[PDB]
Design a protein around this ligand. Structure first.
Ligand SMILES: *[C@@H]1O[C@H](CO)[C@@H](O)[C@H](O)[C@H]1NC(C)=O
Ligand SMILES: *[C@@H]1O[C@H](CO)[C@@H](O)[C@H](O)[C@H]1NC(C)=O
Ligand SMILES: *[C@@H]1O[C@H](CO)[C@@H](O)[C@H](O)[C@H]1NC(C)=O
Ligand SMILES: *[C@@H]1O[C@H](CO)[C@@H](O)[C@H](O)[C@H]1NC(C)=O
Ligand SMILES: *[C@@H]1O[C@H](CO)[C@@H](O)[C@H](O)[C@H]1NC(C)=O
Ligand SMILES: *[C@@H]1O[C@H](CO)[C@@H](O)[C@H](O)[C@H]1NC(C)=O
Ligand SMILES: *[C@@H]1O[C@H](CO)[C@@H](O)[C@H](O)[C@H]1NC(C)=O
Ligand SMILES: *[C@@H]1O[C@H](CO)[C@@H](O)[C@H](O)[C@H]1NC(C)=O
Ligand SMILES: *[C@@H]1O[C@H](CO)[C@@H](O)[C@H](O)[C@H]1NC(C)=O
Ligand SMILES: *[C@@H]1O[C@H](CO)[C@@H](O)[C@H](O)[C@H]1NC(C)=O
Ligand SMILES: CCCCCCCCCCCC
Ligand SMILES: CCCCCCCCCCCC
Ligand SMILES: CCCCCCCCCCCC
Ligand SMILES: CCCCCCCCCCCC
Ligand SMILES: CCCCCCCCCCCC
Ligand SMILES: CCCCCCCCCC
Ligand SMILES: CP(=O)(O)C1=CCNCC1
Ligand SMILES: CP(=O)(O)C1=CCNCC1
Ligand SMILES: CP(=O)(O)C1=CCNCC1
Ligand SMILES: CP(=O)(O)C1=CCNCC1
Ligand SMILES: CP(=O)(O)C1=CCNCC1
Ligand SMILES: CCCCCCCC
Ligand SMILES: CCCCCCCC
Ligand SMILES: CCCCCCCC
Ligand SMILES: CCCCCCCC
Ligand SMILES: CCCCCCCC
Ligand SMILES: CCCCCC
Ligand SMILES: CCCCCC
Ligand SMILES: CCCCCC
Ligand SMILES: CCCCCC
Ligand SMILES: CCCCCC
Ligand SMILES: CCCCCC
Ligand SMILES: CCCCCC
Ligand SMILES: CCCCCC
Ligand SMILES: CCCCCC
Ligand SMILES: CCCCCC
Ligand SMILES: CCCCCC
Ligand SMILES: [Cl-]
Ligand SMILES: [Cl-]
Lengths: 336, 336, 336, 336, 336
């Protein structure tokens, strides 16, 4: 029996190696296999990865006439001491178990141990949509010991920044992913003390041109279309009125359609500001002709009682586009 | 073996400490890690937290030449007595178990015990949407012993209002969160007796300006647009009629779009009252011109058989805006 | 050890108390904590409750110098006989287990037993939507023994109609709940015999005024709007035609929007009958003017070749509203 | 102890009864409790049922002074041999376990055994939507032994067609259910040999009148409405043009609304053919008036330079309805 | 006892057969039962299959007077050595367990073993939607040993390309499936070494004609409809203007409806290019008439102050269709 080469029953494996003395160092490496999904309303993401641990335990040393190591599956884990890592700020997680538990242990003749397992985790990520669709988001995954403070267990990245590897084909449907790197920081709990925490960081960006074409283009086109009425004969009332009211209806249907396709986040975003300013411009173009028609009727009635282009159209033809251009300059200087 | 320092087999751990005498006090602290989601149709919310217990048991005392404590994981829990807390009015819950069970026990030389675990819970919350979008909601999470009455177990907050801590970055996508605090109250069950219950309370609010801009603004603009027809020449029938009918169509599409984006709650809310009153105003503006056209035709026919602005337009130009202003004053005095 | 006060190993607990003789009576009480959700397309509902059992077993009697009882958790259940209740016509269910199994046993000195547990269940409920939105639904939850016929186990409500309690704040988002009560009935299985079955009954209703305002009001308004054309000068063709076609478009958009917001049930309901009759009325109003225009043109051409209000408008002004009123009287006398 | 009346430890229950000789016959009965749901996009359905097995085993015979049988729950199953049935072509399944495992065993004095359990299963069903909404679907559930060929285990329906019972109130929200019956057939696996397979068959149909009223009626009405323009004076251009373009807009909104309410199946169905032919008819009605207006203008210009009803309208008034009637005759002769 | 014919307690089954020498070959066969679902937003697919293993172990040989083999269920697996296969790049998986675990073991007298189990797996598949709806996708499922390198375990397809079988009725609702085949390749891990990997490959395609009819047809029809205005009398302003604005509204509603029915992928696809070019064509047709009307008014005013078809219409009647045809030729030569 291979489990008799390790004196399992001759040691108390409820205590850590080196108990009573200096803390035992534990090194960590991570390989990221895929990014599975992201939820903008609930603000979280899901990842699948391999987690590997390295440490030494003299109680597991065994004699050998060669330098070959012994390999075990997950059934040995319950018989020896292993580190208790957990994921901070996670919502749910599990260890894969088909066709059996995806866990491995390798023991060297001198007592060095490698511990490897495959896991899927869902973690929280606070997001800010104020600058949508030009926003940038930063996310992280955090690893910590549950029960051992830094006086008993010292947790560190085994090879610094070389400890993190990512799959060549990692991708998300609606985002671009960039800038993977690692950091470390100490955390304090008033209940028990100081702990080491490890971080994996990355950044997300959107495809700007899709949103420009889908949203900003039609609204600008409809605003430009509302300016055509300034060049139409003011005596053609049955042509001037329906054009304005139909332009208002078209802009309203565009805004409703755009609202239906964005994530349901109930606060003000940059694209909403652009759309509602455009709507106001279209509304004012109808008020302009109402004023023109009333003044012309008044003048004709006065002339008959006593017995060319109106100035308002001439000024509007210049004033409306200049104001829209100025608004665009200010908007794009503010929101980049 | 560390489990032989505690005389595990020398005591009956199916009975409570102090059995037969006064009740044993148990103190509780809570740390809230995140708020995961909220469901308005099903009326519930989800939270992740750390739960910690404090009590003393003389049967667990062990000799020591120093003042160091001993730490165990979840495997020891089945061998000793622990308190049986559960969450009242919950729908589902679980204890996290990656990479192992997230449970810890620490025992002092004199028998003081700390018991800590990490849990996720979904709890019910009755909501009232009568004042939407200006509504305010209050929610709570409740903790109680399953099997021990106040004569056997005395449950209390360990440090009063200092027993509750919350994460600095706790947030929800569509709500603002404020005013965390704790309370206690006694509950009675006719089957078994009186029990102590602990509460965690907080309040939720919406972003008002987003809803004002998205809903109240367009409806007011369309009502103001329907008043333009009162200043148009009454002889221009092919201009007056299509304008009114198209305004009605636009208002209908706005209301349908707004209904499509709110939570599916099937009873009358304040925003519905505002929208349908506005719709009625638009409808009456079309009836007004129908009456004007009929009366003018009657007069012309009578004059020919025998062989300026109509008064109705003049009165409507004043009466419609004043009534709308009065409705707004009453509405906003009622709904704040 | 408390489990040695009960002679656990001195009895066969695979057989029922009173084996070989008369059936053992078992009394039941229920406390309903909440109603969690309802699904109209799948026709089911979800509930959380406390289930309590009462019976006597002389094999569990123990000596005592007082009248104190002994309390155990779920670990003792596997060592003694307990009743095997299950929920008839259910789709899924589970027993809550945080922070431990929510199960309790209390044993009196003379052998009386109380058995209590907390459970969540999803149960089927056939619904009929013919009269929507004026429909009423009745639902039930059923409890039965799996393996014991009425000759071996007699199941009954412990205190009649006083055995059922409900929470003061029980509610559903889209329904009103009323009339909780209990019944019993005998059921027959050809495979094994007769069994006792217990029932919990309740009724659901909708909020009528919300549906009236959202659906019936706009359709009636559009039908009334289509009657305006009967008072407009028949010589104004470019005003009469667009009005009718735009009214048809508006009614179509209303019907599509209403269909999008109801539960996806694919058979004919009362509200569909009302909407499509209204649509037919709007269609006929356009055919009327087509006939009027053709006849007028024919008359003018005939008069020129040889070289006031048309009767159809005069009759339509009376006939259309009277027919609509008659339809409403018949509809509301049929559907209440 | 009742388990000592059966000599459990005196037999090897890892081998089948009759090992080494002829195959052991096993009879099956099924009772269907409900149909829980159906998914058209994923092509599967869910059912809850009772499964019962009958066979004889002389090793379980016990002496008795009467003819009473002994009953056990699921804990005995692990100690004896039972048949290993599984569901072919299923996606997921489970055995109900509240308040305990829903499993029963009854043993007669001579060794006859009844084995009963309650299960829920989701099974695949390939569907064809070419003739929607006039399609018919056939579904089946299949039962087979995992490890025993027909040389070792003979599986059959215990009472032929009387072995299947269904609940009196079985129903689905959007389908009608008819024609339950059973069949059997032999299946071959190249890895191990021939196996017996049992089938449960049934048929599904839709409610035709709901779909006729919701889809076919409005499209026919709009096609008939487009024919009104053929009777309007050709000199009324501002009446003829807007009518045609608005009819096109209305038909487009109807088609979009209809597409939004059907299951998302991305290939051509019969109702799509009907809708797009109707759309083409509406388009051609606008081209007709364009031609008429151009020809009239040409004639007037020619007459002035040199210095009644147009034939196209007269022919269209006859030709359009006859072609639509012919299309309807062909369509309904093809699709029933 | 059949488990005593195999000397289970006489061997260490924590080590592989042939330990210390050449690697043990393991052959694999696969039978695919169904394809359950596909998710375009999350980029994954789900499959159900049978997995079979073949190898030899002299420690399991048993004496026999015949050539009959012995069969066991899943309970024996924990007592002997078996290979540890797992699925690479998977998100979740499980082994079916109704009515018991779907696992079988067959052992020949000379020690040959067959190991069979039924499993469901969800696997990732990166997709590219640039050419939608004319895109083609390729997917794969991968199998590998967790803990044994190629020096200890040699994994191969048992019968080459004949090792893969697929069900005759395998189908997906929205895709066509073709070209199943197998491959193999060696993979390197810096942590432990070289491993053998097996692949199952297949291809997916869409139904092109459904998308052509639903999307490309209406847009082309509306572009052709906008050209009618070039043949209408330029003096009929109240006919020319509303036609153009209503055509713009119709095209906008078509684009919104089409966007609502495609998978929510936020980057530019081929069908979007076609739709927005068509929209631009419709917009330019309105600008054309604006210019014509202004120039005519200028000429009339000049002539009166001093006291036929306009050229722009004549050129547009030719230029617009030729440009649209050229765009179509380029588009369909690029996108096939
Ligand atoms: C390799 O094995 C030899 C014995 O064959 C041993 O003497 C030597 O120390 C080993 N080397 C290492 C680096 O373990
Ligand atoms: C790894 O590189 C990143 C690059 O930004 C740096 O921030 C980080 O500190 C580095 N970590 C180590 C351990 O070198
Ligand atoms: C600390 O340990 C010393 C022994 O070194 C002991 O005498 C003393 O009582 C301890 N103090 C406390 C507060 O436990
Ligand atoms: C904590 O403070 C809140 C503040 O509202 C108060 O309501 C509550 O009673 C306080 N509880 C304790 C234990 O002081
Ligand atoms: C209460 O306890 C006393 C012993 O102190 C006993 O004699 C008496 O019978 C008990 N009464 C009941 C109702 O059990
Ligand atoms: C309880 O009251 C209801 C009231 O309708 C009645 O139907 C039922 O029979 C009563 N049951 C008992 C046990 O009294
Ligand atoms: C019924 O029981 C009697 C003994 O009382 C026995 O002799 C007889 O064979 C039994 N009959 C059957 C059909 O089992
Ligand atoms: C049961 O009846 C159906 C009726 O169609 C028939 O197809 C089937 O063969 C019958 N089976 C038996 C076992 O009689
Ligand atoms: C078949 O069984 C006979 C014994 O009856 C044996 O001698 C022979 O070797 C067996 N053949 C094979 C191919 O196993
Ligand atoms: C199986 O056939 C496919 C056909 O493309 C080929 O690519 C593959 O290499 C073949 N594999 C074997 C093992 O013959
Ligand atoms: C509330 C946070 C600042 C956002 C201010 C936006 C103002 C938008 C005005 C648009 C008027 C149509
Ligand atoms: C039913 C609870 C009181 C709500 C009353 C609202 C009345 C709204 C009338 C709107 C008419 C258009
Ligand atoms: C099919 C069950 C009876 C329902 C009959 C409704 C008839 C509706 C006719 C509406 C015509 C527009
Ligand atoms: C592709 C399978 C045959 C379906 C043929 C339908 C043709 C529809 C033409 C409709 C034109 C508007
Ligand atoms: C961004 C990847 C190349 C896509 C270029 C498409 C340009 C579309 C222009 C449409 C104008 C209406
Ligand atoms: C396919 C041609 C579309 C434009 C035709 C306009 C009608 C011209 C009538 C002579
Ligand atoms: C045992 P605790 O003080 O609750 C704790 C400390 C750090 N890791 C998380 C849990
Ligand atoms: C044992 P019970 O009387 O059902 C009970 C009492 C208080 N906690 C919940 C359960
Ligand atoms: C054992 P059975 O005859 O299948 C049965 C009888 C009554 N309860 C449900 C199950
Ligand atoms: C053991 P197998 O050859 O994989 C098999 C045969 C028939 N039932 C399903 C499984
Ligand atoms: C044990 P490992 O080096 O993490 C590994 C190697 C190949 N299969 C997956 C896991
Ligand atoms: C009318 C669009 C103006 C865009 C100007 C952009 C300035 C950076
Ligand atoms: C037309 C809008 C009137 C708003 C008045 C608000 C009174 C508090
Ligand atoms: C036009 C609406 C008529 C409503 C009459 C109601 C009769 C009960
Ligand atoms: C205009 C509808 C014609 C329907 C004819 C039906 C022939 C079976
Ligand atoms: C107006 C449609 C033109 C289609 C041409 C297709 C060229 C391959
Ligand atoms: C919209 C502005 C009108 C200006 C009238 C003087
Ligand atoms: C836009 C305002 C113009 C005023 C000219 C008198
Ligand atoms: C809408 C009110 C009309 C008033 C006619 C006297
Ligand atoms: C709005 C009613 C006006 C009546 C004037 C005679
Ligand atoms: C819609 C009915 C028309 C009547 C013509 C005589
Ligand atoms: C509505 C029909 C009127 C007929 C009058 C001649
Ligand atoms: C269900 C029949 C209703 C009839 C309404 C006139
Ligand atoms: C739509 C057909 C027009 C016929 C012109 C000759
Ligand atoms: C519909 C075509 C009519 C042609 C008459 C000359
Ligand atoms: C849309 C192009 C107009 C050309 C005016 C010269
Ligand atoms: C489309 C441009 C035409 C210009 C003719 C002068
Ligand atoms: Cl006109
Ligand atoms: Cl018009």
């Amino acid at each position: 029996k291979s489990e008799q080469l390790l004196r399992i029953d001759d040691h108390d494996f409820s205590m850590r190696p080196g108990f009573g003395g200096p803390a035992i160092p534990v090194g960590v490496d991570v390989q990221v296999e895929s990014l599975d999904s992201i939820s903008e309303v609930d603000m979280d993401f899901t990842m699948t990865l391999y987690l590997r641990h390295y440490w030494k335990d003299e109680r597991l040393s065994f004699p050998s006439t060669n330098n070959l190591s012994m390999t075990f599956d997950g059934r040995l884990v319950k018989k020896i001491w292993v580190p208790d890592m957990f994921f901070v700020h996670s919502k749910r997680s599990f260890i894969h178990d088909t066709t059996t538990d995806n866990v491995m242990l390798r023991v060297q003749p001198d007592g060095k141990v490698l511990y490897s397992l495959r896991v899927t985790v869902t973690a929280m990520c606070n997001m800010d949509f104020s600058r949508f669709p030009l926003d940038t988001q930063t996310c992280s995954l955090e690893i910590e010991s549950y029960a051992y403070t830094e006086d008993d267990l010292m947790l560190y990245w085994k090879k610094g920044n070389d400890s993190l590897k990512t799959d060549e084909r990692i991708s998300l449907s609606q985002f671009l992913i960039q800038e993977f790197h690692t950091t470390t920081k100490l955390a304090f709990y008033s209940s028990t003390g100081w702990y080491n925490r490890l971080y994996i960081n990355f950044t997300l960006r959107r495809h700007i041109f899709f949103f420009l074409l889908q949203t900003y283009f039609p609204a600008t086109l409809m605003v430009m279309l509302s300016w055509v009425s300034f060049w139409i004969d003011r005596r053609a009332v049955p042509a001037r009125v329906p054009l304005g009211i139909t332009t208002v209806l078209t802009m309203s249907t565009i805004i409703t359609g755009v609202n239906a396709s964005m994530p349901r986040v109930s606060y003000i975003k940059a694209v909403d500001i652009y759309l509602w300013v455009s709507f106001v411009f279209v509304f004012l173009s109808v008020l302009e002709y109402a004023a023109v028609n009333y003044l012309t009727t008044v003048q004709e009635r006065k002339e008959q009682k006593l017995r060319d282009t109106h100035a308002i159209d001439k000024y509007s033809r210049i004033i409306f586009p200049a104001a829209y251009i100025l608004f665009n300059l200010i908007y794009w200087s503010i929101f980049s």
